[PDB]
């Protein structure tokens, strides 16, 4: 006989919309926070997880829809945030640049597209060379040949405050707490949670800059190790501290460009010009690589491990792009990887202000300069590596090379969402019984 | 929230009180937490979906006569071609998840039979009884 | 929809008739069909919340085992720690507004007790 039951504890894999829950309060009013607080739900006081005795589930770090949802909120918010700000289109005119390492910083004479009176006026500004095309000594800004470059508004702070992702009622998030889970296959010790832990929305490439750590040892995860084209995500169990600076005392000036709107640039440099270097301890870096190579060798049995160098013609892919105080540092990592393993460190960087963030086209953000000098630091907690490929030597030479390369920001987000899966609750079900 | 590593028999012994927690969760509490086109339209859409799902389940319990019931027995016999197992394997060896997967292919048949009989043939019988 | 200042006894007498008007629909017949970009989104938010309120009241009453009824006698005893007043004075000196304010801080507790005691009915 058919008996109908309601409230049956059965779930199926599902994809849904998640809520943004902020971490306590960052409701600043001088400058509003954008990644957090902006249209976000108050913190749900720490609920407990529920372990489901003996429930095993199949988790998959790859093809994880939570990564895709994080991606879309980040891109959408970035654009929504920048949208209501001044266009720098009127600045896409010929520059006459004279300079002031040599011409790192370009001193350019500028003809203003007139903003008010429709009669010509002139001004000057300093630029980093990485924003200028040397197209007779005629210079132009790099992204004027693609789209509208907009200035980020001074009232908006892109500070990466951790965000908790929360399921809508009727949905739940399963979490894998099993030991040394490698991002794929069955997991025991599965619990149900209301929201994820907070994930700091850090945007980086070629090096992770902040995040969670491996519990006991370095854990190397990949969708497939055999296929060299897959990204190998390496999570460290110890933090290595990176110290980045821009020891250049900048005086900011404001140039009128439109009725109701101003452009911010650097007027002058006080004192000598210095390189924006980053510092990593020698000892910690070498010990970190030793551990990675050991675990990586277990995966790639009986071979010498080389890391070699980052390679490509595009700085967005080639160098890490640490975001320090709101300025973007493109750093040379050669000194970190050009070694092998068979049983301080200073990195030069450059500053770039016009960025087609997310390695897309059709838009760019202009980062106004920060007054004075800056310093920041962070915990690396992980690397992104790829394999060099095969050879006609048939690996008799070993030296398997794992290059310090990434280039797809969804891997950063994936690295902390490997523990979570979204499911939906289906309370109805039936079973044979012996009644009416 | 639940267990579900347990067998159908054991899990269901508390359905009377596990239910009415899952039900409650669908509408209550979260909507107090939320009293605060990136995180705009999406939340509105999420609210709408939750309502639509809720009503679907209530409508089916209603169409099948299980109005306000957590456990209800009806006049449709079990077809032994479905999960042709002993009653004990179904209730004491299998879990609810495993069970739902095994008969997932007969869901449409079961639901159609429940609608034809309960509150349908049954209500035409009641209209006849109330004619006097 | 008056007698707000009347006593609880007086106001609950024939609660049902008053209730039918209040409960003829939240919006009665979709604002009695009289009403049938930012303005649009604000109104959708208003309409969705009205729907949620309707359903929440019905769901909670259903959980408590009160369905198709407006007045339900439950399995939870009154705890004098919530209120210790003569039954007669709360019913014939106090109004419903005053009463609801008087025990406002016990709302979560009473409701939680009702869900547990009403759920534990064999079913």
């Amino acid at each position: 006989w058919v008996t109908v039951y309601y409230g049956v504890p059965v779930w199926k894999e599902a994809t849904t919309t998640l809520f943004c829950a902020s971490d306590a309060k960052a409701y600043d009013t001088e400058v509003r926070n954008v990644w957090a607080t902006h249209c976000c739900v108050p913190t749900d006081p720490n609920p407990q997880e529920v372990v489901l005795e003996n429930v095993t589930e199949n988790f998959n770090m790859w093809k994880n829809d939570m990564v895709e949802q994080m991606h879309e909120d980040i891109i959408s918010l970035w654009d929504q945030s920048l949208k209501p700000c001044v266009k720098l289109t009127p600045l896409c005119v010929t520059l006459n640049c004279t300079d002031y390492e040599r011409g790192e910083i370009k001193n350019c004479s500028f003809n203003i597209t007139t903003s008010i009176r429709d009669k010509v006026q002139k001004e000057y500004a300093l630029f980093y060379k990485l924003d200028i095309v040397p197209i007779n000594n005629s210079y132009r800004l790099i992204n004027c040949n693609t789209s509208v470059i907009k200035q980020a508004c001074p009232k908006v702070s892109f500070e990466p405050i951790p965000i908790h992702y929360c399921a809508p009622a009727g949905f739940a998030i399963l979490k894998c707490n099993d030991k040394k889970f490698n991002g794929t296959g069955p997991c025991t010790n599965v619990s149900t949670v209301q929201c994820t832990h907070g994930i700091r929305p850090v945007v980086s490439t070629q090096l992770l800059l902040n995040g969670s750590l491996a519990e006991k040892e370095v854990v190397i995860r990949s969708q497939n190790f055999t296929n060299n084209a897959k990204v190998i995500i390496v999570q460290l169990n110890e933090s290595v501290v990176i110290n980045c600076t821009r020891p250049n005392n900048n005086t900011r000036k404001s140039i009128h460009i439109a009725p109701g709107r101003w452009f911010y640039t650097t007027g002058a440099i006080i004192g000598d010009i210095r390189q924006a270097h980053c510092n990593i301890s020698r000892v910690k870096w070498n010990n970190t690589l030793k551990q990675i190579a050991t675990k990586l060798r277990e995966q790639f049995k009986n071979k010498t491990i080389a890391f070699n160098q980052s390679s490509g013609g595009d700085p967005e892919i080639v160098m890490h792009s640490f975001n320090c105080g709101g300025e973007f540092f493109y750093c040379n990592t050669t000194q970190l990887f050009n070694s092998t393993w068979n049983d301080h460190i200073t990195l030069p960087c450059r500053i770039k202000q016009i960025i087609n963030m997310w390695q897309k086209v059709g838009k760019a953000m202009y980062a106004p300069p920060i007054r004075g000098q800056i310093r920041c630091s962070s915990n690396i907690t992980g690397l992104l590596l790829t394999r060099d490929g095969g050879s006609n030597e048939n690996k008799t030479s070993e030296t398997e090379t794992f290059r310090p390369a990434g280039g797809d920001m969804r891997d950063n987000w994936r690295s902390e969402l490997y523990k979570y899966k979204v499911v939906k609750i289906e309370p109805l079900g039936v079973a044979p019984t012996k009644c009416k | 929230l639940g267990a579900a590593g347990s067998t159908m028999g054991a899990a269901s012994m508390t359905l009377t009180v596990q239910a009415r927690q899952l039900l409650s969760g669908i509408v209550q509490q979260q909507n107090n937490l939320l009293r605060a086109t990136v995180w705009g339209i999406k939340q509105l859409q999420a609210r709408v979906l939750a309502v639509e799902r809720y009503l679907r389940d209530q409508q089916l319990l209603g169409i099948w006569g299980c109005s306000g019931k957590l456990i209800c027995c009806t006049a449709v016999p079990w077809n032994n071609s479905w999960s042709n197992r002993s009653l004990d394997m179904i209730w004491n060896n299998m879990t609810w998840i495993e069970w739902e997967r095994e008969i997932d292919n007969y869901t449409g048949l079961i639901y159609n039979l429940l609608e034809e009989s309960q509150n349908q043939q049954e209500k035409n019988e009641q209209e006849l009884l109330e004619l006097d | 929809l008056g007698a707000a200042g009347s006593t609880m006894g007086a106001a609950s007498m024939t609660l049902t008739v008053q209730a039918r008007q209040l409960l003829s629909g939240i919006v009665q017949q979709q604002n009695n069909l009289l009403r049938a970009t930012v303005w649009g989104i604000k109104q959708l938010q208003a309409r969705v919340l009205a729907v949620e309120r309707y359903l929440r009241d019905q769901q909670l009453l259903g959980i408590w085992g009160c369905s198709g009824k407006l007045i339900c006698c439950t399995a939870v005893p009154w705890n004098n720690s919530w209120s210790n007043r003569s039954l007669d004075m709360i019913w014939n000196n106090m109004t419903w507004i005053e009463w609801e304010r008087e025990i406002d801080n016990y709302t979560g507790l009473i409701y939680n007790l009702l869900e547990e005691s009403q759920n534990q009915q064999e079913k």
Partner: antibody
Amino acid sequence: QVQLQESGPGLVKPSEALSLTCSVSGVAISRHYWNWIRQPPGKGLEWIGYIFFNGNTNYSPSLKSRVTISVDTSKNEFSLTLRSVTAADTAVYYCAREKSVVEPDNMVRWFDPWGQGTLVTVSS
Amino acid sequence: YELTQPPSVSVAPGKTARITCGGNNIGSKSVHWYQQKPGQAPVLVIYYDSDRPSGIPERFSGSKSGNTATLTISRVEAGDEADYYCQVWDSSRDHCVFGIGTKVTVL
């Protein structure tokens, strides 16, 4: 399918608590309800109580003022404690795995694999 | 809740034994049966109202009617001597109720 293994103190004094533990070498504790049943020499069976790992527990009224049950899912075992155990409580204490089918108002349960029981003697 | 059951019954070898119980609303509540050999834990003979589990001989069957319930053992063997018990679950109390056990002797 399931073999249960009893243990206990054997002889206890008339004012002492009795603590018995049964292990399960069959299935996980979390899959089924576990029950205790008493049988005094020369008598029929008396139910003591049931427990499930999620805290759902209940007892036979005759022992309620003196009895508690708990489980430990990490050792895949469960136990019974009866306080102030007297001469009248001499009995064989049995463990069994409970099976069930859920009907709207007449729940049916069975004790299907049984351990063989442990005899508890209570005397001065 | 309590069950009613006779203290004993005796039967000749080869005959059918009728082992019975009763009580209030026995029709509403399923009555299952156990067999206890001296010195052994009880073994389930009938589950639910009449279902024979594996390991129990085909000679064992059950039925429920009115305020009474019966265990039927056809062709009784000397090895069937045992105390046979009825059990019900009182859903309104979680009161697990056993009968006394009918002592069944095969002559």
